Symmetry: C2
Subunit: 230 residues, 2 copies
C-alpha cells in the first residue's frame, strides 16, 4: 500500500466516510479521512489557485485556495512529515469524478523542494502534448489548449463521470536526509472546475507519495485516486 | 546514433583526432572534434568550477572554467541548438580515463532550463547521496561516502583507475524547445576535482545534452569521452 500525504480540494461531501457536510479542503496523512479540514466556498467555472507549503523546522503543513475577488480558504496541520514519508518521493496531482462529475483541469503547476542545499524545482504554465517529464496515470491527459485534464472530458470540454487520473513529476524528489538541517517544499497549481451537475464531484489533490506510486484499485470517486479504502 | 552537444574539459591532447596540442576546453556539436576550443591551464589537484550557458535569442553557447585565485578559461560558439538537438533531452556529465588516468570527481552540479512558449526545470546538488534516485548512472559512475560523484572508477583508497568511463544523467527529461516558442535558455554549473598520479592526466570531463534515451556508445572510451562511437 502506498504512503500518501496530500492536500485535497474535496468538492463532494461524502459524510459516510468522514467528510463534513460541505465542500472542503483538507490535509490527508495516510488516509482519506483528513486530519484537518476547512469549509471550501467553491466557485465552479472560475479559475482557482492552490498553494501548499511546508518546512521541517516549523513542521506545519499549510494550504490556501483562492479565486480572484473573493476571500480564500486555508487549512493547516502540525505534523512531522519526515516521520510519515520516505526520504525519496514523487509528487503529483490527482482527481476523480463518480456518479457526479466536474472538469478537473490544471492550467499550471509548480513545485520547489529544498534540502539543507540540494534542490528541485519545476514550473508548468502550460502542458505539452506529450509531457515526457510527467507520468500520466489513469485518464490524465493534456489537451490542445495546453491544459492538464486529470479526468476525462468530451471534445466540447464537457466532463464525464466515473473517471480518475493523476500526473506525477518524472524525477523523484529527495525530501530528507539524515542530519538535514531543514527540508522544505511548496507547490502551487491553478485549476478550473466546471460542471452541469447540481453537485459536482469528486475533487482534486496535490499529493506526495512513494516513488513507485500508482492508482490504487477501487480508489475512484470519493477516494480521489489516492487510497484503496476509506 | 545519439545526438550530442557537449562542453568538454579535455585534459589529454589527442592530436591524432584534432585536439590542439595542450589541455583544453571545447564545444562539441555532434562530434568529438570540437567546433571551438580554448587553451585550458589545468590546476590538477585543485577544485575547479565550470559554467555553461545558452539562450535561443543570442544563439551563443559559452562555457567558462575557473579555479580560486587564477585566470579563467573561456570558449564560445555561435550555433542555433534548435537545429541540432531534439525538443526533449536529458542532461548529464561524462568522464573517462584511458591508458593515462585521473579522478573525475564532481562535488556539485546545478542546471536550469527555461522555455517560454515560461516553463522551467531547475536542480542543484551540493552533495550526492549513495542512492541518487534522481540520477541515471551509466558505466562506472557512482557516488561515494563523501557525497561526491565519481564519474570514473577510483580505488577504495581514492586512487584513480584507467580504462574507465562513466556518466550521470538527471532523471527527468528536459524540454528545451517547442515550435513557436518565444525564447529558451539553459544554465549549468558543476565543481570538479581532477587529481592524478600520471604526469599527464586523461581523459576529461564533459557536460552534455543528448537524446533522452542516450547511453554510453560502444568504443566511446578514453579520448572519446564516453560520448561518441568514433572520432569522425
Ligand atoms: Ca468527498
Ligand atoms: Ca582529448
Ligand atoms: Ca514540437
Ligand atoms: Mn474530504
Ligand atoms: Mn508559500
Ligand atoms: Mn535551487
Ligand atoms: Mn514542456
Ligand atoms: Mn578535445
Ligand atoms: Mn522556475
Ligand atoms: Mn539527495
Amino acid at each position: 500500500a502506498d504512503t500518501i500525504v496530500a492536500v485535497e480540494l474535496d468538492s463532494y461531501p461524502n459524510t459516510d466516510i468522514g467528510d463534513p457536510s460541505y465542500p472542503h479542503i483538507g490535509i490527508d496523512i495516510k488516509s482519506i479521512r483528513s486530519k484537518s479540514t476547512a469549509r471550501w466556498n467553491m466557485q465552479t467555472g472560475k479559475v482557482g489557485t492552490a498553494h501548499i507549503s511546508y518546512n521541517s523546522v516549523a513542521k506545519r503543513l499549510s494550504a490556501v485556495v483562492s479565486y480572484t475577488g473573493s476571500s480564500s480558504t486555508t487549512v493547516s496541520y502540525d505534523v512531522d512529515l519526515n516521520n510519515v514519508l520516505p526520504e525519496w518521493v514523487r509528487v503529483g496531482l490527482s482527481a476523480t469524478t463518480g456518479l457526479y462529475k466536474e472538469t478537473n483541469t490544471i492550467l499550471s503547476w509548480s513545485f520547489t523542494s529544498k534540502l539543507k542545499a540540494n534542490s528541485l524545482h519545476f514550473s508548468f504554465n502550460q502542458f505539452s502534448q506529450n509531457p515526457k517529464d510527467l507520468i500520466l496515470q489513469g485518464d490524465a491527459t493534456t489537451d490542445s489548449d495546453g491544459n492538464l485534464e486529470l479526468t476525462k472530458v468530451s471534445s466540447s470540454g464537457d466532463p464525464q463521470g466515473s473517471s480518475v487520473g493523476r500526473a506525477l513529476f518524472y524525477a523523484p524528489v529527495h525530501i530528507w536526509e539524515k542530519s538535514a538541517v531543514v527540508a522544505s517544499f511548496d507547490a502551487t497549481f491553478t485549476f478550473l472546475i466546471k460542471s452541469p451537475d447540481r453537485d459536482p464531484a469528486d475533487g482534486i489533490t496535490f499529493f506526495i507519495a512513494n516513488t513507485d506510486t500508482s492508482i490504487p484499485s477501487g480508489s475512484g470517486g470519493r477516494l480521489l485516486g489516492l487510497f484503496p479504502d476509506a
